[PDB]
């Protein structure tokens, strides 16, 4: 019998567990995010949600602005690339970003293929709405997963659906008989060997963050209760009264998601949401 | 032959029977409501109907606003949370609200699951359009039910439909043979054990209020004639000219719903509605 | 508060219940090792196939079978025919099968089984159906499988489906149970029970299409507590041999050697 | 950040001994002997012809161990037997009595319409049917040690076997031609296990022996399947009902062994009698 | 650069090719004036009508026919069955008919005829189909017509259609040829060839449903180069007479008097 092999890019995002990653468009916002306790920042030249709302094309940000943000903080810096645009990824890797987000929020560059992430040293985070999608991204080399949620609305409903769905399926796979795994793998279009891995471990092999629609500290804590490892939040934070306060509030809510007293405290006099 | 047991959050809203609960956005309005005779107030930082109209997301109100209202009156204070947002509920419970309304008027946070209300000490009120919905909410731990009615229109037609429907079904269940209960329970998607309870008692195990579209004293009294235990009325009272007058009028109409002389008196020179 | 009619079918675990139409077949079944027999005046599948109405069997025939063996005797009633059930209870049957194989007497309601002292077994194709029957008072469940074909495919589907759902329910978060219960039309309180125990509160047997020793053992591997087999055993050629073979296959379902042994020179099935 | 080492297996090395050969369905020891003397590389033991049972509207199951053992004692070449799809207990029995290969056959009445047998739980190797690459790889991922086209049963029409053989190969060669970054999309498209798709991309062939089956009625048909890239063929018991069982069986064996020799093919096709 | 397998069927122009199932029929066909015979062990139409699979005939029967006559002998193979073709070529047939009347062996691909020395005849219902077959290597084309009915209506449709399209292609502007080629799914280079010559590059025969002398002559008037006729000639009553009648009708297709003469007292057709 022949022995086949495959890999899983593990250990790259564990450092972010229990934390918040914040979108930032300027070095000033990056500084505020770091001071507020963000575990990493997502550098953006312009808010993708704003671009698509205007019917424009959202692409990789200019290296100039990404570098400026990298020079402003000490925490990890992530940046986005269009789905399938492996050259944009080559560029981000070259300038030294710590993580690349192959994001559906930017305008897809390839509507059939995602990036061959195994061809890169730099780790990637990819979006998913269910287990099948998550496992396909991981099979391609993804080192982190995040819910797709809903972009540009501030409505947490889809993030909740994706979080609950991914976990319902993970726990279901773990509960299935070994002889029932292939049929299920085919049903959800998930790579078989990874389905077997999930059956044996009862979790995803990589960190899984909530993203899209997280607008309040309550929303962030809700995602932690739903089994997510942390959350990504948008630049809306720096678009309301005291951005420093809401940013810190979300960081604290994620760190103490099971403490009602803390959650109530950080939610008080928080100002207008996005 | 094993024997199981289930619970029912009873005895929490009986103190509101025969009364009116008013939506309030400021301490000043809360004071007016209390002076008018309201049995409780519903604290809101902003009218959810207004937010939906603007296509925005309606969420739990800022604790600061809720606390200010709590400090202004002696009657019970309720507040709303989005459907399925159990963390918003954790927060409201922590700040000391007397009742939580898991409201469909706010933007649903979970389109598949409602809050596991048994995990809270604070009682919940939930909306329903029929018996099946009412019993599912009660099975989840609801301590009070209200019609969903129609919000932001001032049209009582849906509240009438919901009130009549719930009661037609309650009385029908009571009229059914014991051997016909399972088929009906399945038909309306209602928890079997609660259907049996309703069959034996001929009513819901918790207080059932009218809500959504009650704009005039006549509307309020109409709901009492249709078998409801009381009514919830919106902040529209504090904008329809001389809020104090219409507020007292509705309270008196509910208290004397079977007295045409009183109903005529309080309806006269009441001013523009909504 | 609610109840669950438990403790009535546990005695049948690991066993085979055989359909019998005569006292002679009943004796053969008992001698073969059957844990109980299902008395039938005529094979429902035959009647149904002939387009006729299949009902409760004549008490005379059931009594003759009861007097021929010492093991429990079951009999069938049409779905919703609670008077047929009153009659079977009165004559002393040990278990009643509210069977979909007989012609349904009520297309809307099943029997209010709580009104009887005698235990009932009901069929199910999934968890929702099983829990509804249990909520009505059923003390035992069986797969509906497929009747009158000898094809085990549906019994396999039902067995696997009920178990996939049971294990899924156990895996669900407590706050996700109501939505699921509503989805499969299952009594909420029983769903919570299954969530806490990871199994059905009553014995669950395979039935419908079990034609060979291999089929019977297969059902045990799929998590069933035993099997019901049709009167086809007394026609295939050697009744005593195939009957004993199925009994032994269930008792040794995890032993390939024994399974191979009892399957050899077994003549031809139904 | 590191790389967790994942592993998986492929049941290779079990069917190579059959390459370039013919496997024949036999219902009696006498036919088994004829098949072996004709040059068959293995025989498929059957108590009754599945196609006939199905046509008669009956249920086709695993054969009685008695008849399988009788066939095993009559020949020296490997003996295979069939089980219904998903019937792992029938498989446990065949393994126990010593069959050399198990055919999880769609020709028998499926026992599980949702799941195939967890073949990794067996020592004895399995051959499974497939109509395309996706199906073939799913069966291999489940542990299959050999694949065969499904073809068409009970008709003697080779058209479907041709379609399956050509389709599996078109897909295999296409996978090999694809860019590495285009493999996941294709794997998803055909419902094929991704790691095996990558394996096929690197090797340009199926990881296990692939035989033609279903509808192979004449020496010309058998040779055709070899030209289409198959490793051998499975033929039905129709050979024992034509006229000269020995001649017919020998003709197929020689046609497969010399599929690229027009003269041999013409020779063995002459005065061969009516098929089936 | 490309090729066209021309020059192989010209010898058959103005003639009749007859289906024969025995050496005796072959002799009758040759004596009647047939330019070639199509050897068949069994009538495909009969087999197909009986729901059976029609394949290449046994080499034994084909050889017996080859040894009985001096004129060319053709034989059929199933569509896409290139091994059957390898066999027919090996035994020395003069022409192979990749026939739709036999049961197709490949529903997607026809035989790569360029890989054979022996010429092939293929059927077609229109110009696109004819050109695709020719592009694959066909050295002769025939209408598909309708088999096993004796109804000439489809042969007429196919003959008229192929010619309407050929003359249309010749009438088209050079800049309109690509769009048309795409429209009828025809190889572009061959379309340009037809545009320049106003005919097919290979012999085109009528076939399928030619039952009477009048039918045969009709096909010649419609621009066909000759006709293929079924073995029905040897059953209608007097084989030698009807066979000779069809041969003479084709040779004198424009002579009403001869056509009337050979049609008289011809017994009854298929």
Pairing of strands D2-10, A2-10: antiparallel
C231 token code pair: 């009167």
Shortest alpha-carbon distance between residue C90 and chain B (Å):
20
Interface of B with A (CB under 8 A): 57, 59-60, 62-64, 67, 84-88, 90-91, 93-95, 107-113
Q: Is B44 in contact with B80 (CB distance < 8 Å)?
A: yes
How many other CB atoms are there within 10 angstroms of residue A194's CB atom?
26
What residues in D contact A189, CB-CB < 8 Å? 188, 191
3-state secondary structure of C54: coil
Interface of C with A (CB under 8 A): 160, 163-164, 167-168, 170-173, 176
What per-residue string of b and e applies to E110-126 under the rule 16 or more CB within 10 Å gives b?
Answer: bbebeebebbbbbbbbb
Distance between CA atoms of B31 and C262, rounded to whole angstroms? 86
Residue D123: closest CA among chain A residues belongs to which residue?
A1
CB contact under 8 A, B186 and C189: no
Shortest alpha-carbon distance between residue C183 and chain D (Å):
22
Breaks following residues of chain D (C-to-N distance > 2.5 Å) = none
Q: Is A41 in contact with A22 (CB distance < 8 Å)?
A: yes
What residues in D contact C149, CB-CB < 8 Å? 59
Instruction: Give the contacts of A243 (CB within 8 A, at least 6 positions apart).
Output: A29, A32, A237
CB contact under 8 A, E90 and D221: no
- Phi and psi dihedrals of A258, rounded to 5? -105, 15
CB contact under 8 A, C171 and A176: no
**Angle in degrees, CA D264, D267, D272, rounded to 5:** 130
3-state secondary structure B174-242: HHCCHHHHHHHHHHCCCCHHHHHHHHHHCCCCCEEEECCCCCCHHHHHHHHHCCCCCEEECHHHHCCCC
Burial of C110 (0-12, 13-18, 19+ CB in 10 A): buried
**Angle in degrees, CA A177, A182, A186, rounded to 5:** 135
What residues pair up with E36 in beta bridges, in sequence order? Answer: E17
3-state secondary structure of B251: helix
Instruction: Give the contacts of C157 (CB within 8 A, at least 6 positions apart).
Output: C125, D112, D113, D114
Distance between CA atoms of C16 and B262, rounded to whole angstroms? 76
Q: At what angle do helices D262-269 and D245-257 cross, to 10 degrees?
A: 170
How many other CB atoms are there within 10 angstroms of residue D255's CB atom?
29
What residues pair up with B3 in beta bridges, in sequence order? Answer: C3
Containing H/E element for C93?
none
CB contact under 8 A, C164 and A171: no
D11 token code pair: 């049941």
Distance between CA atoms of B124 and B142, rounded to whole angstroms? 5
CB contact under 8 A, C156 and D112: yes
The CB-based long-range contact list for D138-141 (8 Å cut-off, 24+ gap) reads D138/A182, D138/A186, D138/A192, D138/D191, D138/D192, D138/D193, D140/D10, D140/D11, D140/D193, D140/D196, D140/D206, D140/D207, D140/D208, D141/A182, D141/A192, D141/D8, D141/D193, D141/D196
Instruction: Give the contacts of E139 (CB within 8 A, at least 6 positions apart).
Output: E5, E6, E7, E8, E9, E95, E113, E119, E120, E121, E202
Q: Is C204 in contact with C155 (CB distance < 8 Å)?
A: no
Breaks following residues of chain A (C-to-N distance > 2.5 Å) = none
| CA B161 from centroid of its chain's CA atoms | 15
Instruction: Give the contacts of A62 (CB within 8 A, at least 6 positions apart).
Output: A45
CA-to-CA dists, residue E6 to A18, E3, E17, E58, angstroms: 80, 9, 19, 29
E255 token code pair: 């002579």
Distance between CA atoms of D86 and D139, rounded to whole angstroms? 12
CATH number reported for the structural domain that contains residue D209 in this entry:
3.20.20.70
Distance between CA atoms of B187 and B174, rounded to whole angstroms? 16
Instruction: Give the contacts of D244 (CB within 8 A, at least 6 positions apart).
Output: D272, D273
| Total number of domains constituting chain D | 1
Q: Do chains D and B touch (3 or more CB pairs under 8 A)?
A: no
Residue of D69, D93, D112 best to disrupt the C interface, most CBs of C under 10 A: D93
Which experimental method was this entry solved with? X-ray
Of residues E73, E43, E45, E79, the one with CA closest to residue E59: E73
Q: Is B102 in contact with B115 (CB distance < 8 Å)?
A: yes
E69 token code pair: 């006559």
Burial of E52 (0-12, 13-18, 19+ CB in 10 A): middle
- Phi and psi dihedrals of B195, rounded to 5? -65, -40
Distance between CA atoms of E195 and E189, rounded to whole angstroms? 10
CA-to-CA dists, residue B226 to B212, B252, B253, C2, C230, angstroms: 15, 17, 14, 32, 58
Does the CA dihedral A83-A85-A86-A89 come out positive or negative?
Answer: negative
| CA D179 from centroid of its chain's CA atoms | 31
Of residues B257, B65, B61, B40, the one with CA closest to residue B144: B40
Q: Is A43 in contact with A77 (CB distance < 8 Å)?
A: yes
Residue of C118, C129, C179 best to disrupt the B interface, most CBs of B under 10 A: C179
Q: Is E14 in contact with E250 (CB distance < 8 Å)?
A: yes
Sheet-wide strand order for B207-209: B207-209, B144-147, B124-128, B99-103, B77-82, B40-43, B20-24, B231-233
Instruction: Give the contacts of B240 (CB within 8 A, at least 6 positions apart).
Output: B246, B271, B272, B273, B274
**Angle in degrees, CA E194, E200, E202, rounded to 5:** 140
What residues pair up with D127 in beta bridges, in sequence order? Answer: D103, D146
Containing H/E element for C64?
helix C59-66
Q: Is E217 in contact with E231 (CB distance < 8 Å)?
A: no
CB contact under 8 A, A267 and B93: no
Q: Is A144 in contact with A125 (CB distance < 8 Å)?
A: yes
Burial of E187 (0-12, 13-18, 19+ CB in 10 A): middle
CB contact under 8 A, E103 and D159: yes
Distance between CA atoms of A198 and A175, rounded to whole angstroms? 10
Containing H/E element for C189?
helix C188-197
- Phi and psi dihedrals of D46, rounded to 5? -135, 135
Distance between CA atoms of A112 and A100, rounded to whole angstroms? 19
Residues in chain E: 270
Distance between CA atoms of E31 and E26, rounded to whole angstroms? 9
Distance between CA atoms of D115 and B241, rounded to whole angstroms? 70
Distance between CA atoms of E37 and E71, rounded to whole angstroms? 7
What residues pair up with E96 in beta bridges, in sequence order? Answer: E75, E120
What per-residue string of b and e applies to B16-54 under the rule 16 or more CB within 10 Å gives b?
Answer: beebbbbbbbbbebbebbbebbbbbbbbbbebbbebbee
Of residues D89, D211, D82, D191, the one with CA closest to residue D138: D191
Shortest alpha-carbon distance between residue C182 and chain D (Å):
25
Distance between CA atoms of C181 and C142, rounded to whole angstroms? 21
Does the CA dihedral A138-A143-A147-A153 come out positive or negative?
Answer: negative
How many other CB atoms are there within 10 angstroms of residue E58's CB atom?
18
DSSP H helices, chain E, are 23-32, 44-49, 59-66, 82-90, 127-135, 153-171, 177-183, 188-197, 213-221, 239-251, 256-263
3-state secondary structure chain D: CEEEEEEEEECCCCCHHHCCEEEEEECCHHHHHHHHHHCCCEEEECCCCHHHHHHCCCCCCCCCHHHHHHHHCCCCCCEEEEEECCCHHHHHHHHHCCCCEEEEECCCCCCCCCCCCCHHHCCCCEEEEECCHHHHHHHHHCCCCEEEECCCCCCCCCHHHHHHHHHHHHHHHHHHHCCHHHHHHHHHHHCCCHHHHHHHHHHCCCCCCEEECCCCCCHHHHHHHHHCCCCEEEECHHHHHCCCHHHHHHHHHHHHHCCCCHHHHHHHHCCCCCCC
Distance between CA atoms of A250 and B88, rounded to whole angstroms? 14
Distance between CA atoms of D184 and A138, rounded to whole angstroms? 11
Of residues A184, A254, A244, A240, the one with CA closest to residue A28: A244
Q: Is E201 in contact with E6 (CB distance < 8 Å)?
A: yes
Shortest alpha-carbon distance between residue D229 and chain A (Å):
23
C87 token code pair: 């009659």
Q: Is E181 in contact with E187 (CB distance < 8 Å)?
A: yes
CB contact under 8 A, B1 and C3: yes
CA-to-CA dists, residue D89 to D96, D276, E150, angstroms: 10, 33, 58
Q: Is D151 in contact with D161 (CB distance < 8 Å)?
A: yes
What residues in C contact A171, CB-CB < 8 Å? 171-172
The CB-based long-range contact list for A60-64 (8 Å cut-off, 24+ gap) reads A60/A85, A60/A88, A60/A91, A60/A92, A60/A106, A63/A91, A63/A95
Range of the domain at D161: 1-276
Q: Which of A3, A9, A17, A80 is catalytic?
A: A80
Shortest alpha-carbon distance between residue C89 and chain D (Å):
37
DSSP H helices, chain B, are 27-36, 48-53, 63-70, 86-94, 131-139, 157-175, 181-187, 192-201, 217-225, 243-255, 260-267
What residues pair up with E17 in beta bridges, in sequence order? Answer: E36, E228
Pairing of strands D21-26, A2-10: unpaired
Burial of C135 (0-12, 13-18, 19+ CB in 10 A): buried
Q: Chains that contact A by 3+ CB pairs under 8 Å?
A: B, C, D
B118 token code pair: 């048994």
Q: Is B58 in contact with B52 (CB distance < 8 Å)?
A: yes
Distance between CA atoms of E173 and D206, rounded to whole angstroms? 51
How many other CB atoms are there within 10 angstroms of residue B132's CB atom?
21
Distance between CA atoms of B43 and B28, rounded to whole angstroms? 12
CB contact under 8 A, E83 and D269: no
Catalytic residues of C: 76
Q: Is C109 in contact with C127 (CB distance < 8 Å)?
A: no
What residues pair up with B146 in beta bridges, in sequence order? Answer: B127, B209
Distance between CA atoms of A182 and A199, rounded to whole angstroms? 11
CA-to-CA dists, residue C43 to A132, C231, E20, angstroms: 48, 8, 60
A204 token code pair: 């995803």
| CA E176 from centroid of its chain's CA atoms | 31
**Angle in degrees, CA B15, B20, B22, rounded to 5:** 115
What per-residue string of b and e applies to D139-178 under the rule 16 or more CB within 10 Å gives b?
Answer: bbbbbbbbbbbbbbbbbbbbbbbbbbbbbbbebbeebeee
Distance between CA atoms of C108 and D100, rounded to whole angstroms? 54
Of residues D143, D196, D200, the one with CA closest to residue D170: D200
Cα torsion for A198, A200, A201, A202, to the nearest 10°?
60
Does the CA dihedral B132-B136-B139-B142 come out positive or negative?
Answer: negative
Q: What region, left, alpha or beta, does residue E137 occupy, with left being phi > 0 and alpha being psi -120 to 50 degrees?
A: left
From the list C6, C112, C178, which residue is nearest B136 (CB)? C178
Distance between CA atoms of D192 and A193, rounded to whole angstroms? 11
Pairing of strands C120-124, C140-143: parallel
Distance between CA atoms of D178 and D201, rounded to whole angstroms? 8
From the list A1, A112, A193, which residue is nearest D6 (CB)? A193
What per-residue string of b and e applies to A140-165 under the rule 16 or more CB within 10 Å gives b?
Answer: bbbbbbbbbbbbbbbbbbbbbbbbbb
Query: Would you give the DSSP letter of residue A141?
Result: T
Of residues A10, A12, A9, A19, the one with CA closest to residue A229: A19
Q: Do chains A and C touch (3 or more CB pairs under 8 A)?
A: yes
Token pair 């360029």 is found at E114
Shortest alpha-carbon distance between residue A192 and chain D (Å):
6
CB contact under 8 A, C164 and A180: yes
Burial of D113 (0-12, 13-18, 19+ CB in 10 A): exposed
Instruction: Give the contacts of C193 (CB within 8 A, at least 6 positions apart).
Output: B4, C4, C201
CB contact under 8 A, C188 and B189: no
The CB-based long-range contact list for C234-242 (8 Å cut-off, 24+ gap) reads C234/C20, C234/C21, C234/C25, C234/C28, C235/C270, C236/C266, C236/C267, C236/C268, C236/C269, C236/C270, C237/C267, C237/C268, C238/C266, C238/C267, C239/C25, C239/C28, C240/C28, C240/C31, C240/C32, C241/C266, C241/C267, C242/C266, C242/C267, C242/C269
Q: Is C19 in contact with C55 (CB distance < 8 Å)?
A: no
- Phi and psi dihedrals of E43, rounded to 5? -70, 115
Q: Is B50 in contact with B25 (CB distance < 8 Å)?
A: no
Distance between CA atoms of E75 and E69, rounded to whole angstroms? 14
Of residues A240, A262, A244, A242, the one with CA closest to residue A253: A262
Distance between CA atoms of B252 and B267, rounded to whole angstroms? 10
Query: Would you give the DSSP letter of residue A211?
Result: -
């Amino acid at each position: 019998m022949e022995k086949g092999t495959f890999q899983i890019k593990t250990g790259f995002a564990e450092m972010f567990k229990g934390g918040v990653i914040m979108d930032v468009t300027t070095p000033e916002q990056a500084v505020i995010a770091e001071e507020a306790g963000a575990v990493a920042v997502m550098a953006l030249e312009r808010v993708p949600a704003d671009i698509r709302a205007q019917g424009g094309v959202a692409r990789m940000s200019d290296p100039k602005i990404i570098k400026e943000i990298m020079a402003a903080v000490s925490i990890p810096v992530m940046a986005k690339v269009r789905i399938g645009h492996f050259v944009e990824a080559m560029i981000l890797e070259a300038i030294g970003v710590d993580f690349i987000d192959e994001s559906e929020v930017l305008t897809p560059a390839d509507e059939e293929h995602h990036i061959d992430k195994w061809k890169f040293k730099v780790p990637f985070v990819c979006g998913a709405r269910n287990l099948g999608e998550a496992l396909r991204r991981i099979a391609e080399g993804a080192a982190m997963i995040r819910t797709k949620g809903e972009a540009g609305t501030g409505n947490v409903v889809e993030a909740v659906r994706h979080a609950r769905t991914m976990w319902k399926e993970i726990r279901y796979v773990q509960s299935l008989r070994e002889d029932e795994l292939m049929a299920y793998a085919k049903e959800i279009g998930a790579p078989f060997e990874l389905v077997k891995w999930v059956h044996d471990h009862g979790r995803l092999p990589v960190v899984n963050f909530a993203a899209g629609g997280i607008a309040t500290p309550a929303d962030a804590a809700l995602m932690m209760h739903l089994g997510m490892d942390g959350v990504f939040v948008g630049s809306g934070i720096f678009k309301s009264g005291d951005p420093r306060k809401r940013a810190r509030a979300i960081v604290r809510a994620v760190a103490h998601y099971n403490d009602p007293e803390v959650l109530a405290e950080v939610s008080e006099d928080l100002g207008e949401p996005m």
